[PDB]
């Protein structure tokens, strides 16, 4: 609820290159780097155009996006006068998952001919960068070939990293479009790979082979997720099956230790990609991952009879063992695919729990896109959104779909709150929304005494010799919030008296002789509760009429966005579900 | 001068338009007393009778080569098909008899053929179906074709649940040409009969 | 000769019916035991080759002329050009018995080693086409498959390896040749010559 | 001493059609018995002589249709075993694996019309040397034969073997396009109400038909 | 007898050369020799 929509970090790319299909954070473990992969960008290999590259956008100082390609080798050969690999239009940049220093730039649409016959099998290959080493990881490239093998496996579709340095790869088209999730550690990638050997086969290859006949054309591994789902600490290998049981959708959560099934789910609507985009993160508070299943092609049962394609995201909460609670989260606008750009946010505001961002690509005005922010709480996950986002540039032939590639759980603007890389491949634009420093503001209004006698006569009205009833108004202000931001918060305190009295107000101050008062109170963040006390008296008996309406004091303060910028130049924001104005009452006896 | 009424067992079949019976591949049966059965075979004389079946409806829109292939033995729901589910090894010949009754004012002809082990044919292969035991039917001359063949096979006794040696084939050589005075649509029937079956090896009962 | 047109008994209206006479005709070159016992090339695999006669091609002489018969009996002698040692194995032994040398190996004598094998099949007479062919069965497990699983012309392939004469295994066979002698054939099948697109199939005949 | 021989040169190579039999390696094999098993043929001509097989006409059909116009040529095909009309016949199936033949070729002519349609036909053999005849008047001066459709509905006409040489090539020459072995013409002379009715034809080996010198067609 | 052309006797006996056949206790040559010829009706010269 603190995304910088005013002046975000704009990132562009080449024309017709789909700049914003696979983005990820990168930290040279300071400095930060963005990873925006363009699948149809110009490559440095001769004779190959629109192949794909990984542009690393520099956010520090000035935005410096540099097109980077790891293994830039040309089309290799095997027999004679026949290219072994066809990198032309390979769409290099469909899934680029990174972890600290490792950059996993996968490519499922990488073609490779058969070692026994001249063909063209899209087997997919990944280019991994371990710190400063450039290696290639492609488990779906060995003895297995077309049909009864891994020819259409497209290794590098659903990739993710765990906590024990285990690369999780998942190809839906493995073995007659069934699927296979091969996870191999980086030690076997940097120590077991050889560019001279074409049949790459690792030792500890934990995956799932063929099964029966009903599992054909199921896309086993369309979305992956990491976390604990059985109780062992090691992150498991979640697999999404969109085409399970006459096209319904089931999620097969495999163990991340010896490859074993744990729990199975059930879809909602037939043909809806029940498992297109998943995100495993804590949302309840128990240090357990909670997979939130996406559903782009879902049609909610409306009241007009005709169904509307709005999408659905199921929010599952894991307790101690594996009791996942499903919470139906319906979409919004029609033709929005609510459940495609799902990315965990983590400690977005340091409120004790983690948050998550779910953006609607094909939704929004003019088919642009609206990024829905879902902040966590003590119970579970909020259903209603908190901030509505819009697009910037327009599109050409491909639909815009603002908000497709996005990650999180990694600080990038150096302040403690992770931002959101909203990468849109339709408009070829990657816009980075920065997280504004959330300020936990705690106000206060102590108007004593409570009861107000009409004939009390305590103070003395200056300028005349007629006593009137008076009361003390002591309003306190306090600010407390984590992050890197100037503590000198210039709050614009607006003092208002008698909100009900439309008519003539009965309560006015003494130092200003006016009901509405303007005060500039600049307090400090994290220090002490800076309070202020003043005296406010009541009008004379021969002025007002009603003697039963309580005095409702309404104070409305607003942080002046001027000197609140530092280093990054970002304006902080207040806490969610916390109004910047308060109002109390004062009874008047008769 | 003509004896033109056949019978097998207690069922007869009289036709008055028989051009003649064609004995295919042999006039007499093989030695039924094999060494691969240790003398535990026996003849079932009660399997020898006809049983009728329907093949297709030869109409005027059928071009050259509308063939029909039914594998013998087919589903016999009588005495003969009881032996298929009660004995493992059995052998027999066949004496088929197809009927294509129109009148003597239709035209065209359809070839009838008993052919062993028939699968995966071409329509270019149909020009040489004459090599098998065959007998033409045209309505200008006859109505029936009566072919008789012995047990052929890779080995002496057969497992009919996993193997079908013969295949009755009728294909149409000239199309049916009706006239102002012919019959519009003729229907091809057939009554098939085994000859001298010999079963060996009793199955256990299904109970 | 006017005949009964549908009885399908053989009729030979000879050339004497319009004057003239017939000559003495000799048919040695069309005998079924003379035309089949000559060497034919088949494509080999690298090491293990079952000695089935229906892996002879359909364009060659005694492969397209062996498929004229439904049932055939013939003793096989092979001639194989190889390197290493070539062990023949009889019908129905386990394929792990190809490595053992007690089975009839032939040591390498340059250039090739021809050797006469007996009919080792259990059946009285081998065959070419089975009905119904490919019936585990009928058909193993699913298996499907996709789209080309229904429309496919790969069902006329036999599965029981009992119509084989056995298997030979060497280090690398290069060219192995079949011929079949004392050949008896039964129950003829149709034989096809290739289809002309012209008025007559004119090919370039040999000429000085 | 030992018996001296001379290991002669030029002899002893592997010939693929030789009458040398290979040395045995595995003896004492007794086959299962096969005696009096049905359907045995000995020579390939006896299958070709006892079993006639259809021809090929325009439209991939074996039958020829009667013609209700002034032109009376039912079919006119050149006489070779590599012809277009003879192609699907079994007789030209095994004559694709030889070089040269001699003897008669029987043609069988079955009429498949109704009982009220009557017609009569003729078939003539035009020897090579000039153009084949296009009318039944001009083809009366060949070695011809006529028949009409009645009770016995099949007619068998044995093509004579006329040639200079004693054997004629079963493969028509690739370059030479005159077809100097001969034509065979079959006509209709008249027909009574035989429109749309067929004449299915067949071909068989003759009484004195014998082939010679086998080679490998190799699906050419 | 086949495609043999040797007038000498074989070296290996009969049973180390072929597979011996066993009796237990042809067609198309009889079919092609029963072929009808001549005419069907009364011919003239
Ligand atoms: Ca398709
Ligand atoms: Mg389909």
Author numbering:
A (entry chain A): 1 to 29, 32 to 503, 506 to 594
B (entry chain 2): 12 to 218
C (entry chain 1): 1 to 208
D (entry chain 3): 1 to 220
E (entry chain 4): 15 to 39, 66 to 85
Study text:
FMDV, a small non-enveloped RNA virus (genus Aphthovirus, family Picornaviridae), exists as seven antigenically distinct serotypes and many variants and sub-types. Structures of several serotypes determined at near atomic resolution have revealed a capsid composed of 60 copies each of four structural proteins (VP1 to VP4). A prominent feature of this otherwise rather smooth capsid is an exposed flexible loop (∼30 residues) on VP1, termed the GH loop. This loop and the RGD motif embedded within it (residues 145–147 in the O serotype) comprise a major site of neutralization by the host humoral immune response and mediate FMDV binding integrin89101112.
Subsequently, for O1M only, we tested the effect of 2 mM Mn2+. This resulted in more complete decoration of the O1M particles than with Mg2+ and the Mn2+ data were therefore used in further analysis. Although the icosahedrally averaged density for the GH loop and integrin displayed little detail, localized reconstruction enabled us to deconvolute distinct modes of integrin attachment, despite the variable occupancy of the integrin2324. For each virus the two well-resolved classes corresponded to distinct poses of the integrin, for PanAsia these were termed A and A′ and for O1M, A and B. The integrin portion for these complexes was resolved at 10.8 Å (pose A, 4.9% of sub-particles) and 11.5 Å (pose A′, 4.2% of sub-particles) for PanAsia and at 8.6 Å (pose A, 5.9% of sub-particles) and 12.3 Å (pose B, 6.7% of sub-particles) for O1M (resolution assessment uses the ‘gold standard' protocol). The slightly different binding mode on PanAsia (pose A′) shows the integrin ‘moved up' and rotated 12° away from the virus surface whilst the second binding mode on O1M (conformation B) shows the integrin rotated by 158° around the vector normal to the virus surface at the point of attachment, to bring three integrin hybrid, PSI and EGF1 domains together around the icosahedral 3-fold axes. These modes of interaction demonstrate the extreme flexibility in the presentation of the RGD peptide. In each of the structures, the orientation of the VP1 GH-loop is unambiguous. The GH-loop is pulled away from the virus surface, raising the RGD peptide by ∼20 Å above its position in the reduced O1BFS virus where the GH loop packs stably on the virus surface.
